[PDB]
Chains A and B, each alone.
Chain A
């Protein structure tokens, strides 16, 4: 029913039609996560190399 906010230009137009009314992590914490994971990979690798040394 009601047409509002009609805006026209050379390129086109826009408007709104209403039919019915209603009723972060820091740089430090990131560095931390990426280094924790790297340390877990380092430990898994060192465990493997120890086992191969045995």
Chain B
């Protein structure tokens, strides 16, 4: 299986989504025209995973852009790689979702969703062998969160044997738009637990902290946060995009990473951590990459890895380096810290190497972990949800769109089940 269909929803979804296509396009040698101007053949070998060929010979991203507002999509279209997207893959309403999950999922989103599925079907039909879908969205707003999870439900109904994966941005009070973000996040998680196969948890708390503590940026913008996201995203999709042995498609990644169907929320990690523009001149040694990629301070989800156990780990090393030194360092980490890797999944750490480094670095490592420490992320959202929900505060925004309190109670309970299910395996 080859083709992945990419969907980006809402302001956050479309902003990280645009950056993703920007970064991977440069790696595959594709320019704003859709014209290849690269040297290596490794660049084109698996280009069909993400790109359509339309005679030119031009490469068109298999990408559908979705919003309930036109704003951020006009931003994308007049942005750097804006011309590359298929204009018919732009699907927008006018009325917005007002950071309201109920509007995205039930009222405004319901009005727009069929048009999105027409574009999904049109893209799915040109595929030799569709692998499945990736979605970029946030959980804190209304469109990416409410409408994004509506879309996932409808995509699963029409394609139940395909893999569904998400890059899901979790909200934090540190970088926050509205007080209702915990409501929107809890309702979205409930969906994600049932209808995705694999979810990369991108924690805005973590991205903020990395920017503040490590990159010495005193006031991080979304741009700074998204630079970390696009690097992580390029990293986690390396094995899908380039010639390679393991985690080479979406189903094989799921089979190695997900021991129990509900526990499919991954903590990504990246090394070296770099800020935008400002370059680093000294390449990292393989021992340094390996130490940094496993460091809590390189994690994109604000969870302490020492507070849990790793179920499974995938590690991707990028650049020209010694594969023998990689195996040794990877083996050294596990042997040194063996109590943090569950002993009932043997050889639960898999490593891949790709020759092509990302732009502006000679060496990089990407970490994908399924840790039971992710539970800290869900506990945090749960705490914020309950603080409001016990006084039913802000609920009228949701009941006004037809929702009952019961739906909140159920979504909370399911998220608490997920928490305690993680705790079960951290002690087994």
Residues of A that sit less than 8 Å from B by CB: 45, 48-49, 52
6 cross-chain pairs, A with B, having the tightest CB-CB distances, nearest first: A52-B157, A45-B160, A48-B160, A52-B153, A49-B157, A52-B156
Please, could you name 9 A-B residue pairs with CB atoms under 8 Å apart, sorted by A?
A: A45-B160, A45-B161, A48-B156, A48-B160, A49-B157, A49-B160, A52-B153, A52-B156, A52-B157
Interface residues on B, range: under 10
Residues 140-190 of B at the A interface (beta carbon under 8 Å)? 153, 156-157, 160-161
**Closest approach, in angstroms, between the C-beta of A39 and any C-beta of chain B?**
16
Q: Closest B residue to A52 by CB, please name it.
A: B157
Residues on the B chain within 8 Å of A48, using CB:
156, 160
**Closest approach, in angstroms, between the C-beta of B55 and any C-beta of chain A?**
38
Docked pose: A52 CA to B153 CA in angstroms: 7
Q: Closest B residue to A44 by CB, please name it.
A: B160
**Closest approach, in angstroms, between the C-beta of B102 and any C-beta of chain A?**
19
Residues on the B chain within 8 Å of A49, using CB:
157, 160
Q: Closest B residue to A53 by CB, please name it.
A: B157
Docked pose: A49 CA to B160 CA in angstroms: 8
Docked pose: A41 CA to B160 CA in angstroms: 12
Docked pose: A16 CA to B161 CA in angstroms: 58
Residues on the A chain within 8 Å of B160, using CB:
45, 48-49
Residues on the B chain within 8 Å of A52, using CB:
153, 156-157
Residues on the A chain within 8 Å of B161, using CB:
45
**Closest approach, in angstroms, between the C-beta of A23 and any C-beta of chain B?**
42
With a 10 A CB-CB cut-off, give which of A45, A48, A49, A52 has the most chain B CB atoms.
A52
**Closest approach, in angstroms, between the C-beta of A48 and any C-beta of chain B?**
6
Docked pose: A52 CA to B160 CA in angstroms: 11
**Closest approach, in angstroms, between the C-beta of A51 and any C-beta of chain B?**
9
Q: A48-B156, A49-B157 are in contact. List 7 more A-B contacts (CB 8 A).
A: A45-B160, A45-B161, A48-B160, A49-B160, A52-B153, A52-B156, A52-B157
Docked pose: A45 CA to B160 CA in angstroms: 8
Q: What 0/1 pattern do residues 89 to 122 of B give for CB contact below 8 A with A?
A: 0000000000000000000000000000000000
**Closest approach, in angstroms, between the C-beta of B73 and any C-beta of chain A?**
29
Residues on the B chain within 8 Å of A45, using CB:
160-161
Docked pose: A14 CA to B278 CA in angstroms: 74
Docked pose: A27 CA to B157 CA in angstroms: 35
Docked pose: A52 CA to B156 CA in angstroms: 9
**Closest approach, in angstroms, between the C-beta of A53 and any C-beta of chain B?**
8
Q: Closest A residue to B157 by CB, please name it.
A: A52
Docked pose: A31 CA to B382 CA in angstroms: 50
Docked pose: A45 CA to B157 CA in angstroms: 10
Q: Closest B residue to A41 by CB, please name it.
A: B161
Docked pose: A19 CA to B101 CA in angstroms: 83
Docked pose: A12 CA to B196 CA in angstroms: 64
Q: What 0/1 pattern do residues 22 to 66 of B give for CB contact below 8 A with A?
A: 000000000000000000000000000000000000000000000
Docked pose: A38 CA to B138 CA in angstroms: 38
Q: Closest A residue to B153 by CB, please name it.
A: A52
Docked pose: A52 CA to B191 CA in angstroms: 12
Docked pose: A48 CA to B161 CA in angstroms: 11
Residues on the A chain within 8 Å of B157, using CB:
49, 52
Q: Closest A residue to B195 by CB, please name it.
A: A52
Residues on the A chain within 8 Å of B156, using CB:
48, 52
Docked pose: A48 CA to B160 CA in angstroms: 8
With a 10 A CB-CB cut-off, give which of B153, B157, B161 has the most chain A CB atoms.
B157
Q: Closest A residue to B154 by CB, please name it.
A: A52
Docked pose: A29 CA to B161 CA in angstroms: 27
Residues on the A chain within 8 Å of B153, using CB:
52
Docked pose: A48 CA to B157 CA in angstroms: 8
**Closest approach, in angstroms, between the C-beta of A32 and any C-beta of chain B?**
24
**Closest approach, in angstroms, between the C-beta of A28 and any C-beta of chain B?**
28
Docked pose: A45 CA to B156 CA in angstroms: 11
Docked pose: A45 CA to B158 CA in angstroms: 12
Docked pose: A49 CA to B195 CA in angstroms: 12
**Closest approach, in angstroms, between the C-beta of A26 and any C-beta of chain B?**
31
Docked pose: A42 CA to B385 CA in angstroms: 39
Docked pose: A12 CA to B153 CA in angstroms: 70
Q: Closest A residue to B156 by CB, please name it.
A: A52
**Closest approach, in angstroms, between the C-beta of A21 and any C-beta of chain B?**
45
